[PDB]
Every structure is written in structure tokens, then in C-alpha cells.
Enzyme design. Structure first.
Site, mmCIF file in Angstrom:
data_model
loop_
_atom_site.group_PDB
_atom_site.id
_atom_site.type_symbol
_atom_site.label_atom_id
_atom_site.label_comp_id
_atom_site.label_asym_id
_atom_site.label_seq_id
_atom_site.Cartn_x
_atom_site.Cartn_y
_atom_site.Cartn_z
ATOM 1 N N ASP A 109 7.254 -5.895 -96.907
ATOM 2 C CA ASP A 109 7.477 -6.395 -98.251
ATOM 3 C C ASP A 109 7.603 -7.925 -98.246
ATOM 4 O OD1 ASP A 109 8.452 -5.686 -101.205
ATOM 5 O OD2 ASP A 109 9.682 -7.315 -100.441
ATOM 6 N N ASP A 169 13.359 -13.203 -96.782
ATOM 7 C CA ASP A 169 14.106 -11.972 -96.959
ATOM 8 C C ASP A 169 13.858 -10.987 -95.822
ATOM 9 O OD1 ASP A 169 15.770 -10.057 -98.074
ATOM 10 O OD2 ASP A 169 14.343 -9.467 -99.640
ATOM 11 N N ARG A 173 15.451 -3.190 -94.897
ATOM 12 C CA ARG A 173 14.891 -2.479 -96.047
ATOM 13 C C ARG A 173 13.444 -2.923 -96.300
ATOM 14 N NH1 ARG A 173 18.301 -6.016 -97.695
ATOM 15 N NH2 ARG A 173 17.536 -7.992 -98.583
ATOM 16 N N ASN A 174 13.077 -4.092 -95.790
ATOM 17 C CA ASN A 174 11.739 -4.626 -95.988
ATOM 18 C C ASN A 174 10.748 -4.358 -94.857
ATOM 19 O OD1 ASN A 174 12.394 -5.597 -98.511
ATOM 20 N ND2 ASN A 174 13.014 -7.617 -97.767
HETATM 21 C C1 LIG Z 1 12.254 11.953 -93.741
HETATM 22 N N1 LIG Z 1 11.522 10.834 -94.263
HETATM 23 C C2 LIG Z 1 10.630 10.109 -93.393
HETATM 24 C C3 LIG Z 1 9.281 9.812 -94.075
HETATM 25 N N2 LIG Z 1 9.440 9.320 -95.446
HETATM 26 C C4 LIG Z 1 8.686 8.214 -95.879
HETATM 27 C C5 LIG Z 1 9.193 7.348 -96.893
HETATM 28 C C6 LIG Z 1 8.421 6.236 -97.316
HETATM 29 C C7 LIG Z 1 7.145 5.985 -96.728
HETATM 30 C C8 LIG Z 1 6.368 4.847 -97.162
HETATM 31 O O1 LIG Z 1 6.647 4.311 -98.235
HETATM 32 N N3 LIG Z 1 5.345 4.389 -96.405
HETATM 33 C C9 LIG Z 1 4.479 3.244 -96.645
HETATM 34 N N4 LIG Z 1 3.355 3.078 -96.046
HETATM 35 N N5 LIG Z 1 2.756 1.882 -96.477
HETATM 36 C C10 LIG Z 1 3.543 1.354 -97.333
HETATM 37 C C11 LIG Z 1 4.608 2.091 -97.508
HETATM 38 C C12 LIG Z 1 5.565 1.551 -98.471
HETATM 39 N N6 LIG Z 1 4.829 0.317 -98.832
HETATM 40 C C13 LIG Z 1 5.349 -0.629 -99.728
HETATM 41 O O2 LIG Z 1 4.669 -1.612 -100.036
HETATM 42 C C14 LIG Z 1 6.777 -0.504 -100.293
HETATM 43 O O3 LIG Z 1 6.958 -1.384 -101.367
HETATM 44 C C15 LIG Z 1 7.809 -0.827 -99.202
HETATM 45 C C16 LIG Z 1 7.650 -1.953 -98.332
HETATM 46 C C17 LIG Z 1 8.593 -2.217 -97.318
HETATM 47 C C18 LIG Z 1 9.712 -1.363 -97.155
HETATM 48 C C19 LIG Z 1 9.881 -0.242 -98.019
HETATM 49 C C20 LIG Z 1 8.927 0.028 -99.040
HETATM 50 C C21 LIG Z 1 3.500 0.118 -98.141
HETATM 51 C C22 LIG Z 1 6.635 6.842 -95.720
HETATM 52 C C23 LIG Z 1 7.393 7.949 -95.296
HETATM 53 C C24 LIG Z 1 10.384 9.994 -96.354
HETATM 54 C C25 LIG Z 1 11.706 10.447 -95.656
#
Ligand SMILES: CN1CCN(c2ccc(C(=O)Nc3n[nH]c4c3C=[N+](C(=O)[C@H](O)c3ccccc3)C4)cc2)CC1
Length: 283
Positions: free
Chosen positions: A162, A141, A145-146
Site C-alpha cells: 500500500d 507509512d 498493515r501495509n
Molecule cells: C485466513 N486468511 C488468510 C488469507 N486471507 C486473505 C486476505 C486478504 C488478501 C489480499 O487482500 N490479498 C491481496 N493480493 N494483492 C493485493 C491484495 C490486497 N491488495 C491491496 O491493494 C490492499 O489495498 C492492501 C494492501 C496492503 C495491505 C493490505 C491490503 C493488493 C489475501 C488473502 C483471508 C484470511
């Protein structure tokens, strides 16, 4: 009960962190601190089936066994308290699809991304995929998105974050990222990640559009199995589009391996006519 690269590991091999050492800071999955190390904390709902429980454990085992700069690191787990935690590298840029959508050039930020930025993301993830391929791990996958970014700004590094599809195999199918033989026979090999990377490359260079615009999953399935392929994204350099169309060869044995994909990305990266191409500006 989990095997990777010919080595076995079990829940006992996970690095358990004392719950008292762990503080949640904010939702992002949470930003947290371990005693001062910044982490993301993934939680298991306390109201979950024993299959959710085994799913969560397998996720921990899978990510803990990888060791590569373009795969999100696992700091540890806290499984002995409730809710159960997996502690992961904090990726402050968030997911790649969202990032591309939020950070695409606009009049308010006319040079927010350049072609070289996208090529570096592509290289980063291709390097992660090469490590999975050389260790015989089929991701199944590979999609924007991952993937996650270390930070929003310059020097960001993209990583595969992911592994849920691989975890599950170990209407929700990621049809738009799958090669013909995965649909038809349900056969997966490393050549199937090559196809998927081709679609991720289209995602990157389209600046975060959904693939096969206007097509539903079943229309995509019939399109692809009939030889149909996506057109180039807007302003996509020919040399980059050609990497995509090679990833989308009908026969798996005709698709490049990731060493070759990396070679071609590096080549695009040094070509001035590629990297001097302006990205479209979204109004
Ligand atoms: C303006 N903005 C920019 C900054 N913002 C964020 C939005 C989301 C994140 C975030 O989830 N960061 C993560 N760090 N490590 C992991 C994460 C997710 N994980 C996971 O394991 C999650 O399951 C995952 C994995 C792969 C892809 C997506 C989610 C491990 C950080 C900043 C908000 C909007």
C-alpha cells in the site's frame, strides 16, 4: 503527471486490460482472473468524487512504476469501464499484521512460526525499503498493515503493498510509526522510513501487537518527543532489539540507512543464539 526515479508517466502509460478479459472470483478488493493469470482486483466506487478519481489514478501510476521483488506488482488497469479496476499481484497470505496475529504460536499450532520466519519477513521488507530509498521515494507509512504475503506457508515472501500516504502527499495520521521531526516540523526524508521500519520490526517480533500498548496517539507523540522508546517484544533477541533502537535514534542523521539495516538483519539471521530463540506461545 507522475514522476519517479526522474522519469515521468501519465495515465497513457498504464497497461489497460480489456474489461472482457477480466473475471471477478471472490472478495478478499477481489480475487480475479485475467485472460489464466490470477490477480487481485482493486475497485473504485462508482459513487466517488473527482478527487477519489484522481486518487485512484495516482495510486495506479505510483505502483506501476516500481520494479522490485518486494513491492507488489501491477498487472495493469481497467480504467475505461466502470467500476474502474487496478489489477495487482495476488498475495494469498493477506496482510502482514493479520497474518502475524492469526499465525502466532498456540498449543494448536505450537511451532507455527520460528524466529527465522520473522527475520525473513524483516529482510524482505527492508529489501523493498532499500529499493525505495535508492530511488529516492519516501514511503511515509511503513507498517505491518501495509505489507502483504505471497502465501501463508513456508517460502512466503513479504512485500510492501500500500502506498496511500505517499499518494496523498503527492486523527488518521500514522502517529505511532512517525519520527519526532515528522511531528514537529512535518519534515520527511528517507530517514523517516528508517524510523518507521524500526516500528515495523517491533510489530513483526511482537507477532502483530499494536505499538506502544496502552498509549493513545497523543501520549505516543509526547513519549517519543521526550526520548521514550518501546521496550523489547516478548522473547526478542538482544541483537534484533538493537536494530530497532538504532532505527529510533532521535537525530535522523544518526539512523542507519537500509543497506546497513539489511546487513544487521543478515547478521542476526546467521547467529544461532538469535534464531534458536523460541517465540512465546499464545494460550
Ligand atoms: C485466513 N486468511 C488468510 C488469507 N486471507 C486473505 C486476505 C486478504 C488478501 C489480499 O487482500 N490479498 C491481496 N493480493 N494483492 C493485493 C491484495 C490486497 N491488495 C491491496 O491493494 C490492499 O489495498 C492492501 C494492501 C496492503 C495491505 C493490505 C491490503 C493488493 C489475501 C488473502 C483471508 C484470511
Amino acid at each position: 503527471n507522475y514522476c519517479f526515479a526522474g522519469k515521468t508517466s501519465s495515465i497513457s502509460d498504464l497497461k489497460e486490460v480489456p474489461r472482457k478479459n477480466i473475471t471477478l472470483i471472490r472478495g478478499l478488493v477481489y480475487e480475479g482472473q485475467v485472460s489464466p493469470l490470477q490477480v487481485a482486483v482493486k475497485t473504485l466506487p462508482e459513487v466517488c468524487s473527482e478527487q477519489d478519481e484522481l486518487d485512484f489514478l495516482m495510486e495506479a501510476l505510483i505502483i506501476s512504476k516500481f520494479n522490485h521483488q518486494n513491492i507488489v506488482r501491477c498487472i495493469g488497469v481497467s480504467l475505461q469501464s466502470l467500476p474502474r479496476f487496478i489489477l495487482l499481484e495476488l498475495m494469498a497470505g493477506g496482510d502482514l499484521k493479520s497474518f502475524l496475529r492469526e499465525t502466532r504460536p498456540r498449543p494448536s499450532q505450537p511451532s507455527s512460526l520460528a524466529m527465522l520466519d520473522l527475520l525473513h519477513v524483516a529482510r524482505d521488507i527492508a529489501c523493498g525499503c532499500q529499493y525505495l530509498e535508492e530511488n529516492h521515494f519516501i514511503h511515509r507509512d511503513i507498517a505491518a498493515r501495509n505489507c502483504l504475503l505471497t502465501c501463508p506457508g513456508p517460502g512466503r515472501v513479504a512485500k510492501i503493498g500500500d502506498f496511500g500516504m505517499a499518494r496523498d502527499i503527492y486523527a488518521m495520521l500514522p502517529v505511532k510509526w512517525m519520527p519526532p521531526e515528522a511531528f514537529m516540523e512535518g519534515i520527511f526524508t528517507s530517514k523517516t522510513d528508517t524510523w518507521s521500519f524500526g516500528v515495523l520490526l517491533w510489530e513483526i517480533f511482537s507477532l502483530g501487537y499494536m505499538p506502544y500498548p496502552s498509549k493513545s496517539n497523543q501520549e505516543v507523540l509526547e513519549f517519543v518527543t521526550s526520548g521514550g522508546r518501546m521496550d523489547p517484544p516478548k522473547n526478542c533477541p538482544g541483537p534484533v532489539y538493537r536494530i530497532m533502537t538504532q532505527c529510533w535514534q532521535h537525530q535522523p542523521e544518526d539512523r542507519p540507512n537500509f543497506a546497513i539495516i539489511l546487513e544487521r538483519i543478515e547478521y542476526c539471521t546467521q547467529d544461532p543464539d538469535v534464531i534458536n530463540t523460541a517465540l512465546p506461545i499464545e494460550y
